[PDB]
Structure formats: structure tokens, C-alpha cells
Amino acid sequence: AQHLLHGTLHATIYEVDALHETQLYATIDLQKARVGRTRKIKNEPKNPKWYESFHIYCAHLASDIIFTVKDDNPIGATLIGRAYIPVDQVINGEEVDQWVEILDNDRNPIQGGSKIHVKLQYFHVEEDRNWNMGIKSAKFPGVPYTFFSQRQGCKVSLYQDAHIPDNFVPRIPLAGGKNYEPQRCWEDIFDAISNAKHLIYITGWSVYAEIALVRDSRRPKPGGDVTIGELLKKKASEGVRVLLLVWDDRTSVDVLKKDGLMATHDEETENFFRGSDVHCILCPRNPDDGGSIVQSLQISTMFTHHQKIVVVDSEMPSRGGSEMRRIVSFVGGIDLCDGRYDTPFHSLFRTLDTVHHDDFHQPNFTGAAITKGGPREPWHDIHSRLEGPIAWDVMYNFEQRWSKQGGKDILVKLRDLSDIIITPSPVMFQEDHDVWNVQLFRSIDGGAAAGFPESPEAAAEAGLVSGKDNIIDRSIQDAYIHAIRRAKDFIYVENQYFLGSSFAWAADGITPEDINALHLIPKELSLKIVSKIEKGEKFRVYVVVPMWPEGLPESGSVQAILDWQRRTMEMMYKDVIQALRAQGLEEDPRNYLTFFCLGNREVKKDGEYEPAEKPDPDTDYMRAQEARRFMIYVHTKMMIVDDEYIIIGSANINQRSMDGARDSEIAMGGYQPHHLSHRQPARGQIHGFRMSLWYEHLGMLDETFLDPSSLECIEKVNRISDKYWDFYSSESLEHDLPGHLLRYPIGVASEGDITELPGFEFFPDTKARILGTKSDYLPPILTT
Numbered sequence: 001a002q003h004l005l006h007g008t009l010h011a012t013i014y015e016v017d018a019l020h021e022t023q024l025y026a027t028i029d030l031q032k033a034r035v036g037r038t039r040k041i042k043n044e045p046k047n048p049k050w051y052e053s054f055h056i057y058c059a060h061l062a063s064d065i066i067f068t069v070k071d072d073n074p075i076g077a078t079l080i081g082r083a084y085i086p087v088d089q090v091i092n093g094e095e096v097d098q099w100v101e102i103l104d105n106d107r108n109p110i111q112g113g114s115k116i117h118v119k120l121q122y123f124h125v126e127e128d129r130n131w132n133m134g135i136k137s138a139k140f141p142g143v144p145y146t147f148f149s150q151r152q153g154c155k156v157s158l159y160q161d162a163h164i165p166d167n168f169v170p171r172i173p174l175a176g177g178k179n180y181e182p183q184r185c186w187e188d189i190f191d192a193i194s195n196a197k198h199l200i201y202i203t204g205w206s207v208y209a210e211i212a213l214v215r216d217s218r219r220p221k222p223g224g225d226v227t228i229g230e231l232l233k234k235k236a237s238e239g240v241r242v243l244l245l246v247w248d249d250r251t252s253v254d255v256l257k258k259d260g261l262m263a264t265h266d267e268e269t270e271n272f273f274r275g276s277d278v279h280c281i282l283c284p285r286n287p288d289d290g291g292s293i294v295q296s297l298q299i300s301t302m303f304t305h306h307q308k309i310v311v312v313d314s315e316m317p318s319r320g321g322s323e324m325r326r327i328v329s330f331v332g333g334i335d336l337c338d339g340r341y342d343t344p345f346h347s348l349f350r351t352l353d354t355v356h357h358d359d360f361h362q363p364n365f366t367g368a369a370i371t372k373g374g375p376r377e378p379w380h381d382i383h384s385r386l387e388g389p390i391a392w393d394v395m396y397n398f399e400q401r402w403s404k405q406g407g408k409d410i411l412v413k414l415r416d417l418s419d420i421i422i423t424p425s426p427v428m429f430q431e432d433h434d435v436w437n438v439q440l441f442r443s444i445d446g447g448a449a450a451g452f453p454e455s456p457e458a459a460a461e462a463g464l465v466s467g468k469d470n471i472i473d474r475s476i477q478d479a480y481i482h483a484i485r486r487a488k489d490f491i492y493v494e495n496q497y498f499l500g501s502s503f504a505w506a507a508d509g510i511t512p513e514d515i516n517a518l519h520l521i522p523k524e525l526s527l528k529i530v531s532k533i534e535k536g537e538k539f540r541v542y543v544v545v546p547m548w549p550e551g552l553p554e555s556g557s558v559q560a561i562l563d564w565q566r567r568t569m570e571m572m573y574k575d576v577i578q579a580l581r582a583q584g585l586e587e588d589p590r591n592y593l594t595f596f597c598l599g600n601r602e603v604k605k606d607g608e609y610e611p612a613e614k615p616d617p618d619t620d621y622m623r624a625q626e627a628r629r630f631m632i633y634v635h636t637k638m639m640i641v642d643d644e645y646i647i648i649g650s651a652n653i654n655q656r657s658m659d660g661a662r663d664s665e666i667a668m669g670g671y672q673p674h675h676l677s678h679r680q681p682a683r684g685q686i687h688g689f690r691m692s693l694w695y696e697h698l699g700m701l702d703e704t705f706l707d708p709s710s711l712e713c714i715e716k717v718n719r720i721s722d723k724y725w726d727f728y729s730s731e732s733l734e735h736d737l738p739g740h741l742l743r744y745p746i747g748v749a750s751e752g753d754i755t756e757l758p759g760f761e762f763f764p765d766t767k768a769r770i771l772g773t774k775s776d777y778l779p780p781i782l783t784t
């Protein structure tokens, strides 16, 4: 490991020239990091011949690029050769077109001649016209090598939580002279469902038919008390085509109940719509490549369809009148199930006799229930509404899924409604300063979605890659990579998971190549920080994660995940410290990369709901109840870059979501072309949205928050978050927490190692190790 390939590797793998029911393929490694594989080409034996374009994104230390030729026959797997090509030949720019050799294990050659042929060419990241330049013009063409292309003429409504009460957001001034206006997710979903006339298409990891979408007594909507299940049956009865694709976890219902069993009522919902006009379909999810035959058998009950989609037809944005319809779609992190309704208040105890009395979510305690009291787990999340042509791309993703894994041939035929539902159309003129350019992205494979291109040439144009048994759409990871690479001022992430780039982890008690969390997001982040230190340019990265991922915090799963997270932070912090040290700067690396979680703490006021019962005596449950504090769960999957570009979707920053062929995901990336930060700072809708989230978490607006690349900003934000952690973790309680953003409770050693905060080996009120524990039982494929 000596040279750094940070950029893009164009490669074509041609043949072997010799040698002496086969299924034969070839893989590309960068030293030990797999970055590509050809298709299994089959019957053909001696001179097997693939010609596969590869567009590879690199952020790797390497001495050699290595091609391995292998045979995967079910009669038995088998390695053939191993070609080397020192990266020295490739760092320069160049176009290495060798007829390189197919060698063996001691590194002398295989049978008697040939010799693999390959074409390579490496572009460092600075070759890209947008590296360190941002979106840089309203002519920006989008992310390349993706299945969906950028759309123009779109409108995006950014959703902070499921609901926002009146008089919540402060005055946040935006470019056109107007103040930021907050939108209401579930209010808008209720209206879109209520008003549909032709189609309603929904996919979820969980749909619970009993939730009511509208609950704010000071913002009442007629019919709002109806449950989503009864709303959909009413709509279907009128003749609207209501199609649902809800994840089928293929565990049967566990009739018994230990009470932070979070269950995806999948059988219950399918049953709820039986005999109605709603067509609900349980949709199984089998991954593409499960590893061992032994490994595959333990894991293939455990991968999910994770897309949260609602698609409806809606009336034409319109003054009057009259006749016609468009398509409107929703994507983000918010499923239509229990535990997801919340507001930025994120109350622990003060809503249990109002909006949460029959929607009590708390899976981190054994046997938590409303009858025993708080704290509930509050739900911070982010969603979006997409109008304009982009809405039809989400609809089309549903159509590909329904055709491959759905039910009867009952998709609404838009060609038959050409006189009612328009073709995919702008909702605004491109000259309107509110207009959005939006592009859809996915993690999905050919086993879950019909209609992917077949020829390897058409696949590579869409950025699709060959899997074990299916073609793979990984445009979500690619969209994150480009969004990070073009970043020039700051990145703000809120995500449920933050772990990956395991090829660059320290071999510390693990064999890194075993982990296979190969997506690049954490490495592109730290490489981006590194490059701005080197240029003397200001840059900051803020990351908001949950205090711990949902579940009992001592459970093997949570502790495994917290250990992956710790190794990812540790690798990043060593990149940043090494770069700082290389400039002879002695600085706090937390002034360049800073990690947060969320928390609440409420005093007990008179007249609060008093539960009848009580947790058991020395439980995590009882401690939390007495300390009056708990985490605010970060379910967000969102990244804001430079106040000008935003990604919202279902995809977590882990290998499960970023791989392509594990869970199925969806996200949108967008910007407003008239509100870029190329020469001014951007002050459009994405800026107002960031400021509203910051107001929610920090409890205040501050001048410094306008420019988060400034040192003054990151410093003020950390300092405040340190004070909130002290308020949070203190045993005494004088007053409510003034904000929610807590410095993530870890310390960074002077060399990058992650250390425990003195006195906080365990999260407050728990016996769960903040630093995580590697599991002996869970395979990395399940937890990364």
C-alpha cells in the first residue's frame, strides 16, 4: 500500500489469450479491495472473452491493480490465475493497454503461455470539471452513469419530521424576499391520497393500517381521523387503483410479545386488505450474493425492501381549472407505520396522553408500554414531495417492481389515459427562481425490478454493474460520491447509520477484507477534508447519527454496529490528523470533522400523564424514566452540501443500503438552479431547510450558522453541543434541555484512536458500551 488512487478508473477487461458447464468470470482488485467483476461467461471454456466497460470509483491505497480469473461452477468453485499491474504504471494519467500475464500463487506464471489482456486509465478527482467547484452552474447536467437522468422543471417540498405545528419555525429570510415556510409531510400525504382519482401506489418496509395521518388538534383536516387503512379502502372503492408493495419478512408472526418487539405488520396488513379493492402484495427480498452457501442460508431471511414510496395522481397546478391530472410522488425515510409520527418538539413524556397515547414506540427497553410510561422514542426523520417529471421516475420504479415481484397485470396504463394524465411535465418554467432540477437514484438489482438493460454496453452507460446472479443499480452510492467530490464549503449529514470504507480500516482485531463494507462514503469524506487542508481552504463536515441504532443497546447487533461506526470514525480521524500534521498544524481535528447524536430531557410538569404502572426496578427502563431523558432517534437519510444540493432517501450510510444488491433503496438528489453557491452563498429552499433543522436541534439561530464552512460556526456548534451533552448526562436536572444536539459521547485521542469519555463507558442509564463490541455470532454481511 503506497499510492493513492482517488478518482475514477476506466477499465475494460478483454480476454485471456490462451489457456489450458463452466461459469467463468474475472474480478478487479485494488490490492485487497474488490472494485469490479465481469459477468459469468458460461459455457465457453478456453479463450472466454467478455468485453465489459467498467467505470470504477477509487479511494484506495494500492501497490498493484490485480485481476483474478475464477470459475464458480456448482460442481465446485475454483481460482484460475492472478494478473498484476503495478499502479505506478497508472498514476500518471496515462492509458495502459497491456497484454498482461495470468499468473499463479507463488507468482510464477501459469500454463505455458498466456496472459490476460486489459485496458486501464485512471483520472484523479481533480480532472473532473466540478471537483471542489460545487454544482457551479444551472447548466449542470447531473450525475453520469445512472439509470435515471436529471429532470428539470420540478418542485421539491422538503419535510422536517412527519409534522410541524404552527408557530414553530422562526423567521428565516430567503433570497426572493420571503421567509422560509415549513411543510407538513403527513398532512400532504393525507391530501394526496384523499384526492387521488386514478392511482395510489405505495411501497414500505412496514405499513401499519391503523395509523392516523392527521393528529394535530390545532390543525384539523376533515376526515383526518380516518386510519390509512380505511382511507385506502375508501379510495379503492371509488375506482382508484390502489397498489401496495410491502416488505415480506419471512418470519411468521410471533404470537408472544416482549414489548419493544418492533414488528412490520406485514401479514396483518395483507390480511387487512384481503377481500377489499386494495391490492396489497407482500414482496420478498432475496439478496444477490450472500457469500458462502453456509452463509447464504443464515442470512437470506434478513434482507429487506426498504423503499418508502407514495405515488398518486393529482390536480393540475392551476388557477382554475380544469380537467387534468399529473403525478406526484414522495420519497424519504418515513414509513407509514407506528412510531413515525412526531414533530420537532420530540417529546419524551408530554404527548403520551395526546398524539402518542395509541402510538407508543420504544424498542430499546424490555417490555416498554404506554401503561408504564415514558420515555417514548421520539422520531427525527426527513422526507420529501417531488413534482414535475421526477414524479414519473418514482412511479416507474414502482412499475418495475410490480412487474417483477408484484401481483396481477393491473398497473394503470398511462397510455390509455393520455387525455387525462399528462405526459411527464414541468410544474414551473425553468426561469422561475423556485424551480428544481432533480434526479432519482436507487439501490436495486435485476431480481427486484424488471426492465434493466441487458447488453453489458447498455448496463455500463447506466452505471449498472454485474452481480453474482443479477445486474445491479448502485446509483445511490454514486450520487453520494459525486455530491461529496464536488463539495467546496461544508457537508451536513444526518443518518441512521454511519459506517463503511472498511477496506481502509485498521487491521485491529479484525481482518479488514472480511468485512466487505466497501462503499466509499466515509473515505471520500475524509479524503475531501484532507484535500482542503492541503489547499489552505476552509471546509467542514458535520455528521448527526443516533446515540445508538434502534434496539436493546447491549444486544449483539447494536454493539456490532457501534463497533463498525467506531472503526470508521477512527480511520477518518487518522486521515484528518495526518493531514493536519503534514502541514505542521496543531489543531483539534474536531474543528474539521465533528460527530453528533440527538437527545431530549424534560422536567416533570404538573398535570403530565401519570402512568398506572411502572418499569421493573433496576432496568434501563426505570433509569430513563427517573432521569427524564432519552435519545431522539435519528432515522434521517439525508445529506446537504454547500447549502445548494440535497439528497433525501431511504438509504443509510452502511453497506446494506449503499451496495446496490442488498436492501432495495431509493433517493432523490436535487438543487434549485437559481440558488447555487458559485459566487454568492446559496439562500434558496435548501438553505432555509438546513437552518430550520439547525434551529430544531440547536434551539437557536445564530449569525455563524449562515456560513458553516467558517471556524467560528463549527466551534460555536461544538461548544453548544458540549453544553447539551453535559445537561443531558448530568445526574441533576434543573430545566428542560434547551436544544437536542449532543456531541457524540466519545473522545478522539491525539493520534485518532477513539476513546471513552471518562465516566461514560456506558450510555447514560444503560450498561451498553458506547464504543461497541465486535460480535462472534453475527456475520459482517448482516451488520455492515
Ligand SMILES: CCCCCCCC(=O)OC[C@H](COP(=O)([O-])O)OC(=O)CCCCCCC
Binding pocket: 205, 304, 306, 549, 550, 551, 552, 555, 556, 557, 558, 561, 656, 663, 782, 783, 784
Ligand atoms: C437489536 C437491534 C439492532 C439495532 C439496529 C438495527 C435495527 C433494525 O434492524 O431495524 C430495522 C431495519 C429497517 O428499519 P429501520 O431501521 O430503517 O427502521 O431493517 C433494516 O433493513 C436495517 C438493518 C441494518 C443493520 C442492522 C441489522 C443487524
Ligand SMILES: [Ca+2]
Binding pocket: 160, 161, 343, 344, 346, 379, 380, 381, 696
Ligand atoms: Ca425532528
